Symmetry: D2
Subunit: 124 residues, 4 copies
């Protein structure tokens, strides 16, 4: 409810990427993502989930979402998942860690997956 | 197509958890997850994405999905994302890495996120 | 050489932790770490390695180090490894990702490892 | 003591890499690593730390180590850290997660770090 409202909207990360999400009453996340970097052009579908009844101790709201990097313009044969928590208030944030897996041969599977962290704000 | 067919079904990981997924023609993943471990009971909604047009060099198919650990029985104030690749054939596998974030206070945010790896097969 | 000089010293991360390191000519890192958070008191031994001949294209210098969280005051039955890169200049930084593993039972091994990111500066 | 003995020796992972380590009485790990894959040839220095007084409940022993991928033959401008736990007994194992950072430009820092998992045994 509070965080359905707080999460729904347009977010921006430190790279200049754009995350457009709707948080549903059932815990769904749906929207589009546009990366400022990488083998990417325009918007990509995203879907995910969030805790629709977080704790009321002042904890964050756990959430995550996935982008497969295929759309009408490109196919980067890869998928990113962001896992993190939403923190509400005047300077709301979504603080995330992500895993970006590329499809590989079996011989290259050891080097399939990048790891990083993205912080999203409502302003940038 | 090939991997819509190959991905859709029931999968099992090394912990004894059960992953029930439908891969759509558009790149969607939908289903339910049941963990054998942790603060979890019964099935949880999952949603994700996969590369619906993978390479044909013998590479894996990149995919990912999210579970928020809230259902009618429990709320563990946390979300897991799995990022990985599907590898088809007689002993098909989905090889994943995952990030499990709990909602935390700001003071505890440094210890919000677990990391691990799960391998899913069609048999176990 | 340049980065032996640049890396050797006292660093501080965003949590207020203190990283005291000597970079040797052979690629060694030695020193002590003091965490501002967690099950930790005072200084802990650290050892690691760095690229002692980085690229000269303006790339970072790859490095990593380990702390086992045992000293004369406490034993937290855990170890952290930081992996990252040093970036020199007026606002030098060491940008890292870390893995913090606790010793667990086999049944709890799935939840053994925390993941996070720390940015170190010469000032804070 | 028990794990000084148990950890010291030659280990092998699922890729066919060779990890030669000495565990000291003070918690030090020293040795050499030879990767079966990647931009690597021959042995590389490793250093790390382990919990020299683990719990006696049947928990694992937390440890970690670093390799910078520079030696007399090659320089891959990168460093790997493994974080994990040693589990003793007839089929002893070291179960690890790793982070492999390459030195990058600032513009490429988002894609600096690979993540994976290696399981080491005394036999393979
Ligand atoms: C050879 N070996 C070292 C690699 C070199 C480059 C790459 C990889 C990859 C996977 C595994 C290895 C490598 C990989 O998936 N890739 C990306 C492919 N896929 C893409 O480029 C799609 C855009 C991804 C944008 C990310 S999502 C997290 C972050 N947050 C944002 O807002 N934007 C960024 C590489 O380049
Ligand atoms: C205090 N500090 C060290 C922790 C101790 C325990 C925990 C945490 C967590 C997050 C951060 C820190 C801790 C966290 O999210 N948690 C889990 C809470 N949430 C749950 O238990 C929900 C079930 C999660 C099951 C996982 S999904 C990846 C894997 N694959 C499967 O098939 N099953 C497992 C902890 O316990
Ligand atoms: C139950 N389940 C969810 C957990 C809950 C709490 C914990 C864990 C752990 C491991 C696995 C699970 C959990 C774990 O290792 N632990 C830490 C134990 N060990 C310690 O507290 C030692 C200090 C570590 C300080 C870190 S190093 C990275 C960062 N950067 C800094 O400068 N300071 C921080 C937990 O609490
Ligand atoms: C372009 N983008 C997607 C990448 C593509 C390839 C690479 C990277 C890297 C870092 C970041 C991105 C990429 C990176 O560090 N690299 C490795 C460079 N460095 C090396 O190859 C040194 C050998 C590393 C061997 C590892 S250690 C963990 C594992 N366990 C073993 O026993 N052996 C393996 C890449 O290739």
């Amino acid at each position: 409810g509070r965080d359905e409202a707080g999460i729904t909207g347009t977010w921006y990360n430190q790279l200049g990427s754009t995350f457009i999400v709707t948080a549903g009453a059932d815990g769904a996340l749906t929207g589009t993502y546009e990366s400022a970097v990488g083998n990417a052009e325009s918007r990509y579908v995203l879907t995910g989930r969030y805790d629709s009844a977080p704790a009321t101790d002042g904890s964050g709201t756990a959430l995550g979402w996935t982008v497969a990097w295929k759309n009408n313009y490109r196919n980067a044969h890869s998928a990113t998942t962001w896992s993190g928590q939403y923190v509400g208030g005047a300077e709301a944030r979504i603080n995330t860690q992500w895993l970006l897996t590329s499809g590989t041969t079996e011989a290259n599977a050891w080097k399939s997956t990048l790891v990083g962290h993205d912080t999203f704000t409502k302003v940038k």
